[PDB]
mmCIF file of C-alpha atoms and ligand atoms in Angstrom:
data_model
loop_
_atom_site.group_PDB
_atom_site.id
_atom_site.type_symbol
_atom_site.label_atom_id
_atom_site.label_comp_id
_atom_site.label_asym_id
_atom_site.label_seq_id
_atom_site.Cartn_x
_atom_site.Cartn_y
_atom_site.Cartn_z
ATOM 1 C CA UNK A 1 50.652 -19.311 -78.497
ATOM 2 C CA UNK A 2 49.564 -20.616 -75.044
ATOM 3 C CA UNK A 3 46.378 -20.074 -72.966
ATOM 4 C CA UNK A 4 47.561 -17.549 -70.337
ATOM 5 C CA UNK A 5 45.499 -14.338 -70.448
ATOM 6 C CA UNK A 6 45.731 -10.817 -68.963
ATOM 7 C CA UNK A 7 49.435 -10.923 -68.092
ATOM 8 C CA UNK A 8 51.729 -7.891 -68.198
ATOM 9 C CA UNK A 9 54.984 -8.654 -70.091
ATOM 10 C CA UNK A 10 58.077 -7.731 -68.028
ATOM 11 C CA UNK A 11 60.797 -9.257 -70.248
ATOM 12 C CA UNK A 12 61.294 -11.571 -73.194
ATOM 13 C CA UNK A 13 60.264 -14.519 -70.984
ATOM 14 C CA UNK A 14 58.669 -13.222 -67.734
ATOM 15 C CA UNK A 15 54.980 -12.262 -67.418
ATOM 16 C CA UNK A 16 53.022 -11.131 -64.328
ATOM 17 C CA UNK A 17 49.376 -10.825 -63.330
ATOM 18 C CA UNK A 18 47.431 -9.962 -60.173
ATOM 19 C CA UNK A 19 45.894 -13.385 -59.575
ATOM 20 C CA UNK A 20 45.150 -16.135 -57.055
ATOM 21 C CA UNK A 21 47.456 -19.002 -58.112
ATOM 22 C CA UNK A 22 44.752 -21.624 -57.322
ATOM 23 C CA UNK A 23 42.085 -19.827 -59.395
ATOM 24 C CA UNK A 24 44.647 -19.358 -62.206
ATOM 25 C CA UNK A 25 45.629 -23.084 -62.284
ATOM 26 C CA UNK A 26 41.979 -24.228 -62.306
ATOM 27 C CA UNK A 27 41.220 -21.941 -65.272
ATOM 28 C CA UNK A 28 44.374 -22.593 -67.373
ATOM 29 C CA UNK A 29 45.280 -26.164 -66.345
ATOM 30 C CA UNK A 30 48.950 -25.479 -67.242
ATOM 31 C CA UNK A 31 51.536 -28.148 -67.920
ATOM 32 C CA UNK A 32 53.434 -27.062 -64.777
ATOM 33 C CA UNK A 33 52.279 -25.194 -61.689
ATOM 34 C CA UNK A 34 55.011 -24.292 -59.184
ATOM 35 C CA UNK A 35 54.405 -24.852 -55.487
ATOM 36 C CA UNK A 36 56.195 -22.786 -52.843
ATOM 37 C CA UNK A 37 57.211 -25.900 -50.930
ATOM 38 C CA UNK A 38 59.248 -26.614 -47.828
ATOM 39 C CA UNK A 39 61.783 -29.443 -47.612
ATOM 40 C CA UNK A 40 59.247 -31.737 -45.904
ATOM 41 C CA UNK A 41 56.509 -31.084 -48.476
ATOM 42 C CA UNK A 42 54.239 -30.142 -45.560
ATOM 43 C CA UNK A 43 51.562 -28.035 -47.329
ATOM 44 C CA UNK A 44 49.998 -26.059 -44.489
ATOM 45 C CA UNK A 45 49.820 -22.404 -45.550
ATOM 46 C CA UNK A 46 50.327 -19.944 -48.389
ATOM 47 C CA UNK A 47 50.617 -21.312 -51.930
ATOM 48 C CA UNK A 48 51.245 -24.859 -50.662
ATOM 49 C CA UNK A 49 48.198 -24.987 -48.381
ATOM 50 C CA UNK A 50 45.959 -23.304 -50.962
ATOM 51 C CA UNK A 51 47.011 -25.647 -53.789
ATOM 52 C CA UNK A 52 46.866 -28.594 -51.436
ATOM 53 C CA UNK A 53 43.386 -27.608 -50.235
ATOM 54 C CA UNK A 54 42.262 -27.261 -53.853
ATOM 55 C CA UNK A 55 43.372 -30.884 -54.473
ATOM 56 C CA UNK A 56 41.248 -32.100 -51.517
ATOM 57 C CA UNK A 57 44.545 -33.083 -49.754
ATOM 58 C CA UNK A 58 45.619 -35.427 -52.576
ATOM 59 C CA UNK A 59 48.779 -33.334 -53.013
ATOM 60 C CA UNK A 60 49.672 -33.948 -49.344
ATOM 61 C CA UNK A 61 49.006 -37.704 -49.613
ATOM 62 C CA UNK A 62 51.257 -37.974 -52.663
ATOM 63 C CA UNK A 63 53.885 -35.784 -50.992
ATOM 64 C CA UNK A 64 54.004 -37.874 -47.818
ATOM 65 C CA UNK A 65 54.661 -40.992 -49.902
ATOM 66 C CA UNK A 66 57.426 -39.112 -51.776
ATOM 67 C CA UNK A 67 59.135 -38.073 -48.514
ATOM 68 C CA UNK A 68 58.791 -41.542 -46.976
ATOM 69 C CA UNK A 69 60.662 -42.933 -50.001
ATOM 70 C CA UNK A 70 63.187 -40.167 -50.746
ATOM 71 C CA UNK A 71 63.632 -38.062 -47.623
ATOM 72 C CA UNK A 72 63.479 -34.279 -47.548
ATOM 73 C CA UNK A 73 64.333 -31.944 -50.379
ATOM 74 C CA UNK A 74 67.241 -29.492 -50.196
ATOM 75 C CA UNK A 75 66.639 -25.788 -49.723
ATOM 76 C CA UNK A 76 67.033 -24.548 -53.295
ATOM 77 C CA UNK A 77 65.872 -27.914 -54.657
ATOM 78 C CA UNK A 78 62.723 -29.292 -56.249
ATOM 79 C CA UNK A 79 60.796 -32.350 -57.264
ATOM 80 C CA UNK A 80 58.165 -33.009 -59.931
ATOM 81 C CA UNK A 81 54.934 -34.595 -58.725
ATOM 82 C CA UNK A 82 51.377 -34.757 -60.031
ATOM 83 C CA UNK A 83 49.439 -31.562 -60.673
ATOM 84 C CA UNK A 84 46.213 -33.360 -59.643
ATOM 85 C CA UNK A 85 43.162 -31.302 -60.731
ATOM 86 C CA UNK A 86 45.210 -28.094 -61.145
ATOM 87 C CA UNK A 87 47.912 -28.875 -63.750
ATOM 88 C CA UNK A 88 49.595 -31.786 -65.490
ATOM 89 C CA UNK A 89 52.557 -31.541 -63.094
ATOM 90 C CA UNK A 90 53.418 -29.687 -59.913
ATOM 91 C CA UNK A 91 57.025 -28.546 -59.548
ATOM 92 C CA UNK A 92 57.587 -28.290 -55.780
ATOM 93 C CA UNK A 93 60.387 -25.744 -55.336
ATOM 94 C CA UNK A 94 61.980 -24.889 -51.976
ATOM 95 C CA UNK A 95 63.029 -21.278 -51.706
ATOM 96 C CA UNK A 96 64.877 -20.188 -48.567
ATOM 97 C CA UNK A 97 62.618 -19.287 -45.641
ATOM 98 C CA UNK A 98 64.062 -16.075 -44.127
ATOM 99 C CA UNK A 99 61.779 -16.607 -41.065
ATOM 100 C CA UNK A 100 63.850 -19.817 -40.389
ATOM 101 C CA UNK A 101 67.351 -18.331 -41.032
ATOM 102 C CA UNK A 102 68.070 -19.806 -44.496
ATOM 103 C CA UNK A 103 70.594 -18.215 -46.916
ATOM 104 C CA UNK A 104 68.843 -15.821 -49.347
ATOM 105 C CA UNK A 105 71.619 -16.654 -51.872
ATOM 106 C CA UNK A 106 69.769 -19.965 -52.287
ATOM 107 C CA UNK A 107 66.907 -18.105 -53.976
ATOM 108 C CA UNK A 108 68.813 -18.113 -57.280
ATOM 109 C CA UNK A 109 69.356 -21.877 -57.004
ATOM 110 C CA UNK A 110 65.631 -22.311 -56.345
ATOM 111 C CA UNK A 111 64.689 -20.360 -59.482
ATOM 112 C CA UNK A 112 67.174 -22.400 -61.577
ATOM 113 C CA UNK A 113 64.773 -25.341 -61.226
ATOM 114 C CA UNK A 114 62.324 -23.448 -63.444
ATOM 115 C CA UNK A 115 64.754 -23.738 -66.389
ATOM 116 C CA UNK A 116 64.004 -27.457 -66.687
ATOM 117 C CA UNK A 117 60.451 -26.609 -67.884
ATOM 118 C CA UNK A 118 59.527 -24.701 -71.048
ATOM 119 C CA UNK A 119 56.494 -22.945 -69.549
ATOM 120 C CA UNK A 120 55.368 -22.561 -65.916
ATOM 121 C CA UNK A 121 52.676 -20.897 -63.830
ATOM 122 C CA UNK A 122 54.387 -19.810 -60.647
ATOM 123 C CA UNK A 123 54.382 -17.567 -57.570
ATOM 124 C CA UNK A 124 57.292 -15.390 -56.485
ATOM 125 C CA UNK A 125 59.591 -17.623 -54.405
ATOM 126 C CA UNK A 126 60.650 -16.908 -50.782
ATOM 127 C CA UNK A 127 58.181 -13.990 -50.437
ATOM 128 C CA UNK A 128 54.920 -13.751 -48.490
ATOM 129 C CA UNK A 129 55.233 -15.923 -45.370
ATOM 130 C CA UNK A 130 58.779 -17.090 -46.314
ATOM 131 C CA UNK A 131 59.981 -13.620 -45.200
ATOM 132 C CA UNK A 132 62.049 -12.309 -48.138
ATOM 133 C CA UNK A 133 61.490 -9.076 -50.091
ATOM 134 C CA UNK A 134 59.203 -9.700 -53.122
ATOM 135 C CA UNK A 135 60.899 -6.947 -55.172
ATOM 136 C CA UNK A 136 64.126 -8.914 -54.737
ATOM 137 C CA UNK A 137 62.488 -12.234 -55.589
ATOM 138 C CA UNK A 138 61.159 -10.773 -58.851
ATOM 139 C CA UNK A 139 64.624 -9.445 -59.723
ATOM 140 C CA UNK A 140 66.219 -12.856 -59.115
ATOM 141 C CA UNK A 141 63.466 -14.503 -61.162
ATOM 142 C CA UNK A 142 64.057 -12.195 -64.141
ATOM 143 C CA UNK A 143 67.839 -12.606 -63.877
ATOM 144 C CA UNK A 144 67.744 -16.425 -63.506
ATOM 145 C CA UNK A 145 64.799 -17.976 -65.345
ATOM 146 C CA UNK A 146 65.209 -18.285 -69.116
ATOM 147 C CA UNK A 147 62.071 -20.343 -69.823
ATOM 148 C CA UNK A 148 58.584 -18.807 -70.043
ATOM 149 C CA UNK A 149 57.265 -18.000 -66.574
ATOM 150 C CA UNK A 150 53.789 -16.649 -65.771
ATOM 151 C CA UNK A 151 53.882 -15.146 -62.257
ATOM 152 C CA UNK A 152 50.660 -14.972 -60.245
ATOM 153 C CA UNK A 153 50.794 -12.328 -57.480
ATOM 154 C CA UNK A 154 47.851 -12.728 -55.050
ATOM 155 C CA UNK A 155 48.068 -9.334 -53.320
ATOM 156 C CA UNK A 156 46.813 -6.492 -55.549
ATOM 157 C CA UNK A 157 48.748 -3.922 -53.570
ATOM 158 C CA UNK A 158 51.994 -5.893 -53.928
ATOM 159 C CA UNK A 159 51.350 -6.468 -57.645
ATOM 160 C CA UNK A 160 51.079 -2.716 -58.243
ATOM 161 C CA UNK A 161 54.266 -2.116 -56.262
ATOM 162 C CA UNK A 162 56.126 -4.839 -58.193
ATOM 163 C CA UNK A 163 55.123 -3.415 -61.576
ATOM 164 C CA UNK A 164 55.744 0.229 -60.653
ATOM 165 C CA UNK A 165 59.208 -0.481 -59.209
ATOM 166 C CA UNK A 166 60.338 -2.935 -61.913
ATOM 167 C CA UNK A 167 63.585 -2.000 -63.657
HETATM 168 O O1 QJ0 B 1 50.884 -16.383 -50.240
HETATM 169 C C1 QJ0 B 1 51.277 -16.419 -51.356
HETATM 170 C C2 QJ0 B 1 52.757 -16.170 -51.673
HETATM 171 S S1 QJ0 B 1 53.256 -14.461 -51.336
HETATM 172 C C3 QJ0 B 1 52.324 -13.351 -52.413
HETATM 173 N N1 QJ0 B 1 52.184 -13.488 -53.739
HETATM 174 N N2 QJ0 B 1 51.423 -12.460 -54.166
HETATM 175 N N3 QJ0 B 1 51.102 -11.703 -53.113
HETATM 176 N N4 QJ0 B 1 51.664 -12.254 -52.016
HETATM 177 C C4 QJ0 B 1 50.318 -16.718 -52.509
HETATM 178 C C5 QJ0 B 1 50.672 -16.598 -53.831
HETATM 179 N N5 QJ0 B 1 49.627 -16.931 -54.571
HETATM 180 C C6 QJ0 B 1 48.565 -17.278 -53.781
HETATM 181 N N6 QJ0 B 1 47.311 -17.681 -54.125
HETATM 182 C C7 QJ0 B 1 46.412 -17.980 -53.203
HETATM 183 C C8 QJ0 B 1 46.749 -17.876 -51.854
HETATM 184 BR BR1 QJ0 B 1 45.405 -18.312 -50.542
HETATM 185 C C9 QJ0 B 1 48.032 -17.466 -51.471
HETATM 186 C C10 QJ0 B 1 48.973 -17.158 -52.478
#
């Protein structure tokens, strides 16, 4: 028994709720929150900017030190950094950005990173401003992640579409 509340159960291990990921993290303080990162860990917009803003830019400061030491992530890759005031840890995961021409087949590789963590609060990867179809991202999530994932979908209209079209 964990502390996530109000989620709709999609499968054995995948749950979904119409929620702002920042407001969710602040309320639950999960072990792992997933960031929709880019390879440079430049948190300007979407999940990344909202989480980063909620950390008063501490996420960006930590991220810039990480990149200066390690160089960029791979598309499909991840790193574990601090969760600051939002979570114990933040798993920064790079899904492909369709709006930049990256291979959508890398979305499965991106979701595989979730399997290294027993429980995660996470957004749908590669959707929103990354330009891929959210219905597809949810399907890949369900078909790839085996650990317990709590998906926060910001847009109420999209949430209803995702639930109603879920197979
Ligand atoms: O932008 C995205 C990804 S795309 C999407 N996911 N659900 N609807 N659209 C966000 C996901 N969670 C968020 N929380 C706060 C803010 Br600000 C933005 C998002």
